[PDB]
Amino acid sequence: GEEQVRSCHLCNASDPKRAHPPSFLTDLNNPHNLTCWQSDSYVQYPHNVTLTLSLGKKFEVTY
Amino acid sequence: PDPCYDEHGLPRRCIPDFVNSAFGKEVKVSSTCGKPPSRYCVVTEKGEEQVRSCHLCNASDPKRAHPPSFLTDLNNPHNLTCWQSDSYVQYPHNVTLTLSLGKKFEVTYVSLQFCSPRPESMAIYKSMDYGKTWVPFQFYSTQCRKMYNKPSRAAITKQNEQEAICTDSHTDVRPLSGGLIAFSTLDGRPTAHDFDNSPVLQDWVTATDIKVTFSRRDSYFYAVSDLQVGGRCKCNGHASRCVRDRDDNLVCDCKHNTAGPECDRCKPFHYDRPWQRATAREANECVACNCNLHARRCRFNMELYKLSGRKSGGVCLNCRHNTAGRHCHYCKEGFYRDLSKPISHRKACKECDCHPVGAAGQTCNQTTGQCPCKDGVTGITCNRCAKGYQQSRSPIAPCIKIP
Amino acid sequence: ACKECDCHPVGAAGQTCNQTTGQCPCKDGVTGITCNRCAKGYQQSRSPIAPCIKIP
Ligand SMILES: *[C@@H]1O[C@H](CO)[C@@H](O[C@@H]2O[C@H](CO)[C@@H](O[C@@H]3O[C@H](CO[C@H]4O[C@H](CO)[C@@H](O)[C@H](O)[C@@H]4O)[C@@H](O)[C@H](O[C@H]4O[C@H](CO)[C@@H](O)[C@H](O)[C@@H]4O)[C@@H]3O)[C@H](O)[C@H]2NC(C)=O)[C@H](O)[C@H]1NC(C)=O
Ligand SMILES: *[C@@H]1O[C@H](CO)[C@@H](O[C@@H]2O[C@H](CO)[C@@H](O[C@@H]3O[C@H](CO[C@H]4O[C@H](CO)[C@@H](O)[C@H](O)[C@@H]4O)[C@@H](O)[C@H](O[C@H]4O[C@H](CO)[C@@H](O)[C@H](O)[C@@H]4O)[C@@H]3O)[C@H](O)[C@H]2NC(C)=O)[C@H](O)[C@H]1NC(C)=O
Ligand SMILES: *[C@@H]1O[C@H](CO)[C@@H](O[C@@H]2O[C@H](CO)[C@@H](O)[C@H](O)[C@H]2NC(C)=O)[C@H](O)[C@H]1NC(C)=O
Ligand SMILES: *[C@@H]1O[C@H](CO)[C@@H](O[C@@H]2O[C@H](CO)[C@@H](O)[C@H](O)[C@H]2NC(C)=O)[C@H](O)[C@H]1NC(C)=O
Ligand SMILES: *[C@@H]1O[C@H](CO)[C@@H](O)[C@H](O)[C@H]1NC(C)=O
Ligand SMILES: *[C@@H]1O[C@H](CO)[C@@H](O)[C@H](O)[C@H]1NC(C)=O
Ligand SMILES: *[C@@H]1O[C@H](CO)[C@@H](O)[C@H](O)[C@H]1NC(C)=O
Ligand SMILES: *[C@@H]1O[C@H](CO)[C@@H](O)[C@H](O)[C@H]1NC(C)=O
């Protein structure tokens, strides 16, 4: 409405349903069962925030 | 699974189901026929007048034995189990039977089944201790006064709903045999509907041990076929059942972070909000202390919880990992906060690695780790030279101005 | 086989245990491996700096 409210949760990768793998980024995106991958916290500039993935085929990209 | 947790694994009140209590246990008594072997005669009504039968009592005769197990065994309404007392006895004399339980309970039903006629004067007792202290509960007589100095069918004042009443009701015979006595303490109590918020009634139901003492040509005696009393194991709504101990001791498996065999207190290291009873509105649970993974023992003060707007009052003791505070939540004198590390990192505290020369003091901003920068030096550990400031090999002053 | 150091948060003068002996930094009258107990002739005190002190 007008003010703030903060919830809170936890992450065990060994907990499948409580894990947040990058597969949450590659899986089908349900607007009703979204798949939130999660980063580590307490992080900011100045630091490299790098994620990697190679292709194996050259492409032209639009979207 | 566990009724202590909702469909969403939310801690909710979990309670043992309502069960009969006085079923199958042994009782030490003060009198019984048959030692030496005793006899007894029995009267019956026929049409309009009377007729008297008669029998014998040897406990060494199993078929002529009638143990108190006959009160606790299953009583078949077609195969009754009547225990019998000695005869030729009456007021003034204690006809006392005891039962020491060891656990405090809340009771709803107290049912009875008689093989002897209903006498006139008697009362109720209990022990919220383990067979040492004894307090009455109610009286029962036509002359509650001449016998017990009591009124018959007194009123239950709201200001003391823990009154002990006496009545002549159902002190009549018929019923001689098969007397049915059921007692609900909740009768008459105005604050019985909201029992969840009736602690005095939640205290009036508290009972651990039970004692029953009686006052009030022919052989007259007393006999009874069975006993049933319903209740639920008192875990304050914090355990759905009660189990045996490794040393044979029935205790609640106190859930909801509660302690004591009855869930009466909070668990060790659970001192932030006071101990409370699970309500239909809120399970008013206990809560451990917050140390952010930096302590194992804690204490509490109400004023902390008081001034918290009644929200929290926990405080940790002996904050490890170079941490400190009520939540063991800051680095002591000597480190700084490694802000890069998470807020609960066990090594979030590290020595003020201040440039032992370039920093002016031996400390650093516990938040920033900003070491004490000397005259023209800046930087957290104070190492760098400034614009127009040339570093010198002097172990005292490196950066030097430009003309 | 390896568990994090459990140095007595007060009675040990550090949070690092003697990885061989696990002996935390026991301060003058503090004893115990994690440096928690006070020694015989040292009673626990509520002072946040001197927990264990000799007696005259
Ligand atoms: C990561 O996220 C997951 C998912 O939420 C959490 O899951 C935990 O998983 C562990 C798995 O070990 C669970 O531990 C459970 O408790 C047992 C306690 O020891 C008893 O073991 C058996 C009964 O299981 C008894 O006969 C015995 O006498 C002990 O009394 C563990 O021993 C069990 O795990 C054991 O099983 C595996 C095989 O399945 C064996 O290889 C091992 O020996 C292993 O010890 C048992 O599964 C625990 O219940 C789960 N916690 C939950 C669901 O909250 C993790 O907790 C979480 N990790 C972190 C660090 O948060
Ligand atoms: C309290 O209640 C009990 C149980 O009902 C009654 O117990 C009595 O129990 C005894 C058995 O202990 C019964 O006695 C029976 O009668 C025999 C009579 O003596 C003859 O014995 C044999 C045949 O049995 C002959 O060869 C012999 O020549 C005698 O003529 C007893 O001898 C028997 O008891 C023997 O058996 C037990 C084991 O069962 C042994 O340990 C003993 O040696 C014992 O002698 C036989 O069993 C008797 O019937 C019961 N009395 C009854 C039912 O009234 C008590 O009597 C009762 N109390 C009172 C005061 O009545
Ligand atoms: C953070 O910054 C860059 C990537 O964003 C990395 O660059 C390094 O640069 C130094 C300077 O010569 C090289 O010696 C290193 O080999 C480089 N690292 C590489 C190429 O991986 C730097 O390493 C990053 N630091 C991290 C990721 O911890
Ligand atoms: C009969 O009355 C009560 C129980 O109904 C018993 O109370 C006794 O009171 C005297 C008074 O000093 C004490 O010395 C006794 O120790 C009490 N007896 C107990 C506590 O068992 C009295 O003893 C009863 N008489 C009996 C059982 O023979
Ligand atoms: C989303 O999908 C997962 C797939 O296992 C399922 O477990 C979960 O219940 C789904 N979400 C909801 C709200 O049902
Ligand atoms: C009642 O139960 C006892 C238990 O053994 C049995 O001996 C007796 O025959 C039963 N009586 C009837 C009428 O069923
Ligand atoms: C630490 O740095 C902050 C950053 O501005 C400063 O405000 C504060 O006074 C410094 N000292 C502390 C927090 O003790
Ligand atoms: C660990 O304990 C031993 C036992 O005497 C001691 O000699 C040593 O100095 C301690 N510290 C170490 C090994 O760092």
Author numbering:
A (entry chain H): 86 to 148
B (entry chain B): 40 to 255, 271 to 457
C (entry chain G): 402 to 457
Any passages from the paper?
Netrin-1 (NET1) is a chemotropic guidance cue pivotal to vertebrate development, where it plays a key role in attraction and repulsion of axons, cell migration, regulation of cell survival, and cellular differentiation. It is secreted by axonal target cells and functions as both a short and long-range bifunctional guidance protein for axonal growth cones. The dependence receptors deleted in colorectal cancer (DCC) and its paralogue neogenin (NEO1) are crucial for NET1-mediated axon attraction, cell-cell adhesion, and tissue organisation.
To gain molecular insight into the structure of the high-density HO-induced NET1 assemblies, we combined negative stain electron microscopy with X-ray crystallography. Negative stain electron micrographs of NET1ΔC and full-length NET1 with short HOs (HO-dp10 and HO-dp12) revealed long, filament-like distinct structures of up to 5 μm in length and showed that NET1 can form a clustered meshwork. 2D class averages of sections of these tubular filaments showed a continuous, repeating arrangement with comparable outer diameters for both NET1ΔC and full-length NET1. This indicates that the positively charged C-terminal domain is not involved in heparin-induced filament formation. The asymmetric unit of the X-ray structure was composed of 8 NET1ΔC molecules, which formed with symmetry translations a double helical core 200 Å across. Crystal packing yields a tube-like double helical structure similar to that observed by negative stain. Remarkably, the monomer-dimer equilibrium of netrin-1 in solution is abolished in the presence of heparin oligosaccharides and replaced with highly hierarchical and distinct super assemblies leading to unique, yet unknown netrin-1 filament formation. Moreover, our data clearly demonstrate that both, NET1ΔC and full-length NET1 can form filaments.
